[PDB]
Structure 1
Amino acid sequence: SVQIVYKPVDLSKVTSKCGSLGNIHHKPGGGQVEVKSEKLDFKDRVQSKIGSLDNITHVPGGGNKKIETHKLTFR
């Protein structure tokens, strides 16, 4: 007789903690900002950001991926 038992087990724990977590900002102060522009010539796309205080969190990452392949071939 032939007996095949195929019972792999995945009990793993996967965690990602990505970005800004558990920080304290106590009274952050942005200074005065002055922007003076005269006679500027732009011949292509302009991306402009003007601010005093920025808090920026960008997370393209922190993804969890599992690829699993199971093959049982008999005769």
Structure 2
Amino acid sequence: IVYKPVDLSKVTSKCGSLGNIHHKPGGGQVEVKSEKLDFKDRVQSKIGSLDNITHVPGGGNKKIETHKLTF
């Protein structure tokens, strides 16, 4: 019995913002005016002009390989 398997495989993930050229994203002027407001419960507030985000919870990679030989 002669057993000589070869793996040369590439198992790859490329995830997010990549290989990009000359990106010039512009946020404009943002004005928020708030007067005499009442909040009676929990508040979360975001005021921005530009968000650039790559999240990538994924992109995950998994290899299982399994050799059994028996006599």
Change beyond 3 A, Cα 1:71–1:44: farther
Work out the percentage of aligned pairs sharing the same amino acid.
100
| Shift of residue 33, structure 1, vs aligned partner | 2.2
- Higher Cα radius of gyration: 1
- 1:19-58 deviations in Å (ceiling 9; x for gaps): 1012235442212223345676767765443210010111
Q: Given the two structures, how large is their TM-score scaled by the length of structure 2?
A: 0.69
Bigger mean CA deviation after superposition, 57-66 or 28-37: 28-37
Unmatched 5+ residue regions in structure 1? none
| Aligned residues: CA RMSD | 2.5
Mapped to 1, the partners of 2:39 and 2:28 lie a distance apart of 28
Change beyond 3 A, Cα 1:30–1:5: same
Report the count of equivalent residues. Answer: 71
- Does the residue aligned with 1:65 lie in a helix, a strand or coil? strand
Mapped to 2, the partners of 1:40 and 1:34 lie a distance apart of 17
| Shift of residue 11, structure 1, vs aligned partner | 0.9
Instruction: Name whichever structure is richer in strand by fraction.
Output: 1
Change beyond 3 A, Cα 1:26–1:59: closer
